[PDB]
Symmetry: C4
Subunit: 315 residues, 4 copies
């Protein structure tokens, strides 16, 4: 093997991240303003805008979830709080109109009780929210939820970064699979544990397992620019989950931070303050619409068939 040892499988793949690729323009009859940006969040739930906000306590509580749903996306309420309060946040969202909302649960001791409280409060999507879903405890939770509340509630499982892990969640009954393990995020799993998977490759692999079963993939982590959203969807994802890009909006939890005359909000680090969510979402969707124009993609399903060019460090 050119890189060492005698085992060609030891280095299993060349992992590409968003910055490694660009979408190629293609024949187009699509104007950006006329593109259809709707996409499946889960097998049953379609969003008007293929964006959801991260289940993080610096990103999504009730205010963010309401704003996301109104913008045509969805929020996933974080679970770093008592069960009754998360459930109360769900109720708050639901009484602000007929708005979709999700909520995270883990696989710990209180996770089942949390899930039932969220169900009672009227949640639409339960996200089984773990660092590493390729694990019997996680798969069992997904399956148990699906078999218990699956008629009324869509169940998302994550996170994964390989084809085999995605396939396991599909088999367990997941309604969507969330992709992102060491995706290049603030937790720096890559530096601390040495573990990760560049996101374009991770999405391509997960989609290879999910699309043949009609299960949408949520790209979760490492998205820095509006152009990354287009790349994630073209790699085959159906939606993108955003943390850092939304943590600086007015609707996110936390107060303004002023450093050297500039405004920031906290992210757990800090991110530039961006103003209202509606403004950020408008910019992001603007970039996505531009990509759909350039690639001749009338719908997100067409964008999922677009081609890339791989670029070098110089590019």
């Amino acid at each position: 093997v050119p890189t060492g040892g005698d085992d060609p499988t030891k280095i299993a793949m060349l992992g590409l991240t968003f910055d490694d690729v660009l979408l190629l323009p293609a024949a187009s009859d699509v104007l950006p303003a006329n593109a259809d940006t709707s996409s499946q969040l889960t097998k049953k739930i379609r969003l008007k805008v293929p964006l959801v906000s991260s289940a993080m306590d610096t990103v999504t509580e009730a205010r963010m979830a309401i704003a996301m749903a109104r913008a045509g996306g969805m929020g996933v309420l974080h679970r770093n709080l008592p069960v009754a309060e998360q459930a109360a946040q769900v109720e708050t969202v639901k009484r602000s109109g007929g708005l979709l909302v999700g909520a995270a649960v883990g696989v710990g001791d209180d996770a089942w009780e949390r899930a039932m409280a969220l169900r009672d409060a009227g949640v639409d999507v339960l996200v089984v929210d773990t660092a590493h879903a390729h694990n019997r405890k996680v798969l069992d939770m997904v399956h148990r939820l699906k078999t218990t509340v699956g008629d009324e509630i869509e169940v998302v499982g994550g996170n994964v970064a390989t084809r085999a892990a995605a396939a396991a969640l599909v088999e367990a009954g997941a309604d969507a699979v969330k992709v992102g393990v060491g995706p290049g995020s603030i937790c720096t799993t890559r530096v601390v544990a040495g573990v990760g998977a560049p996101q374009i490759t991770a999405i391509l692999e997960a989609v290879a397992a999910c699309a043949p079963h009609g299960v949408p993939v949520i790209a979760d982590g490492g998205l820095q620019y509006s152009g990354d959203i287009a790349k994630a969807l073209a790699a085959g994802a159906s939606t993108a989950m955003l943390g850092s890009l939304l943590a600086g909006t007015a609707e996110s939890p936390g107060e303004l931070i002023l450093v050297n005359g500039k405004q920031f909000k906290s992210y757990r680090g800090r991110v530039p303050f961006r103003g209202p969510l509606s403004t950020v979402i408008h910019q992001l969707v603007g970039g996505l619409r531009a990509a759909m124009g350039y690639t001749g993609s009338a719908t997100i399903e067409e964008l999922q068939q677009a081609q890339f060019v791989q670029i070098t460090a110089a590019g």
Copy 2:
């Protein structure tokens, strides 16, 4: 596939930009001072210097177009102004002697009326000037112009970044094809839309479609140094269109900007002030002539057959 998924065509190519390659020296009987730098702008129009200025409101109005033509190149007047004023700028150029001039038009509602006014004013080249030419509306405009005023006026179409798009413009009747979509320019299409094509690869692909039909390619975007001009032509382009490299000249629109004791002009950002156009063109042509000496290229047509070496990030 080593980079993910099961489709080898998903990542269609490895895209190289100017910084990825160098021209290889070759046997030479050519002194730089003796090289012939003339080249086809379009099927019919040959320039003494293979350079044209961008149709941008911070680069080319009448003053720039006159200076470019006198230097042996050509300017393309921007279209971000009323039809009558663009036409008046064409007349201004034409009465400063027998000087070649081009002008941009779009495909919008006023585009045809604009084109006819430019024709009436005596324009030599009409540039159908769009972000993405691989589109029926753009192709129809190129064809309609060619069939209406094509005896008297050369029609350029752009921009493209693929072989198929270039082939479409050739079929529509374009007299030259302009290449540059997300080429690494100020609009940052790459960041916003996630779309682009590294320019050396884009030129190689466009030339594969254009040269067999005798249609010149204009390299448009991403040229930062005189050496990039030589690389663009060696990749097969016949001329290079320059924005950032000319936006800092005296002849470009806009006033001097003084920041921290240094002089700049606006580019839409800012670029260092460079003095007279003649000085910049002299430097650029000097670099091109040096490249022709090193590669043994007596003419631009010979330079188009030169070879590259690909270099690494370390290089």
Copy 3:
């Protein structure tokens, strides 16, 4: 050959360092808290934590060796001091309980006398400590020690960076092989001599020679983060030797250095002050445990079978 000349073996391999790769998550039943981090330092000696401190006079004297052994690893006492004092440092460690300790020796004139003094003082591991072990003098020393004191003392040989060099040490009787020649360390062998071997490739190659003979490999040099420890072991090493990561701990030789309000210690350069060794080791083992969770590795032997993804400069 694409890179020049007619000899495909002139450039023998593509060398990967830690930053070039990430561990891929895999199916897991392993919780980080439950992983077994024990590993072979030598054929006979197993450590509770697979970490040893460098035989450097800014890293390991008695205080560090005692702290390392108590933390479940081991220190290797440096040899930049008189024989009697190194031996006295060994005695000091041994009387602080039943603690494992190693000590470096060279191949110079006093090296044999040094080794016998260390043996007399009760050392557990002798490390034949050279810049380049692929040399008859070094191999002879390893063999002579092994044949003289090998029943009571384990003999480590190093350093190497190739399969052939590792094989030579195995043949000479080494109980462990230490890998790291121009690994990216403070001596900058790479810059001064132009010599080196990226560590992931060097470990893969050494392990190819050592594992079939049941000889552990010690990864020595270039480890900057806790994640690098996991990568080194997954490449096949059994332990990691740390210099820069430990030189900033309280237990290392040298005084505090205050520069611009920040605290440092000397490394021979300087490194940030990190506090007690126990704290650093806790963080490092925490990262290793996380990696074992993500990869489904119940033991270090299982981690040695994990797979990598190669990443780009963008990643």
Copy 4:
């Protein structure tokens, strides 16, 4: 072709520079102090140290040439001065003992008269010193000199960066071939003309043409560290010519420059002041000797057979 177009030869090679490679350690019986650093400058002339100073007016006049010869290398006197003065500099060197000296000549109108004056003054090596030697005028000059003064004087030709160009100089009768065209030097041929060849690949290619005819290659340009000298020789060069590395020595032309409390000398830019030449040469040869130890190279001829590992941007 993956990088564009339909011609696989358009991008002819992947060019590696010094920073792209490292020397691999190998079995060694060689101590650095015992290595033989002597090497052929030309077919007939062997130097004790394989280093020559650049024919540049900020590097080599008489003082530098005398110091280089005394250190066991050689200086090449620059030609940016009247013929009589260059000849007078040759005489000055020759009367400082039995010291080897070279001198540059061009191919211009005064070049032949210059060469005969240098011959009369007792020069040992004439260097036909051009930017691009693959040219009939340059080849004719090399041949004419060789046929006229070749019994008494060795004739070096340069510069080249390809196998074909090197072969042409060999055929013309060159006693050594100098390699370096856009090697990454202060003239920035790469940026201005877009022309160049990464030096490791350029040396490998030139050596492929020169070694079978017993003609030494001089690596000229891009050497920044002592380790680069070892890499250049291992790629097959017999000597290295140094500009930037020597321009900061006391013996080089020009005065001390003080900027922000630091000392520099001019290079035509500026380089840090390094003190006496003897000191710099000592460091450089020290690095070379270390490389010979690591690679088991008893002689420069053995070092020329050493192997590389290619490293990534991360390395």
